Amino acid sequence: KTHVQLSLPVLQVRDVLVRGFGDSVEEVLSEARQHLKDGTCGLVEVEKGVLPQLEQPYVFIKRSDAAPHGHVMVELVAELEGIQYGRSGETLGVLVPHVGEIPVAYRKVLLRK
């Protein structure tokens, strides 16, 4: 399938134990996609002071369309030193590995895979 329905656990930034997916734009996009497939991916909602608490490169989920079965269509965009790899709509949040942190909420998304 080109798209996969996922429910992403929303994590508080200060709970997150692994604050990024790796060390290159290509690696973080690769790792984020693997974790999304394996159900081991969390979402941190971006506010003032969140991103500097996470590791670059960042992986964002961004709205790709204006929401089948409640699931917002999203795609992945990475960022490193203020340059983004991809082009898409509004940020729903930043992806991080999920290693058992307790979520505050779930974000239903339809991921272009």
Give a structural overview.
The PDB classes it as viral protein. The entry lists the keywords SARS-CoV-2, fragment screen, Nsp1, KIT library, viral protein. The assembly is monomeric. The entry is titled "PanDDA analysis group deposition -- SARS-CoV-2 Nsp1 crystal G02 (dataset 1) from the KIT library screening campaign, data used for ground state calculation". The protein is mostly beta strands and 113 residues long. The chain has one domain: SH3 type barrels, CATH 2.30.30. Helix content is 12%, strand content 40%. The protein contains one helix and seven strands, in the order E-H-E-E-E-E-E-E. Strands 1, 2, 3, 4, 5, 6 and 7 form a seven-stranded mixed beta sheet that branches. Strand 4 and strand 5 form a beta hairpin.
* Helix count from the secondary structure assignment: 1
Overall 3D shape: globular
CATH topology: SH3 type barrels
Pairing-aware structural class of the strands and helices?
Answer: mainly beta
What is the C-alpha radius of gyration, as a whole number of Å? Answer: 13 Å
Q: Distance between termini? A: 8 Å
State the CATH architecture.
Answer: Roll
Helix content: 10-25%
Q: What summary fits the major beta sheet?
A: 7 strands, mixed
Region (Disordered): 1-113
Subcellular location: Host cytoplasm
Protein name: Host translation inhibitor nsp1
Domain CoV Nsp1 globular: 2-113
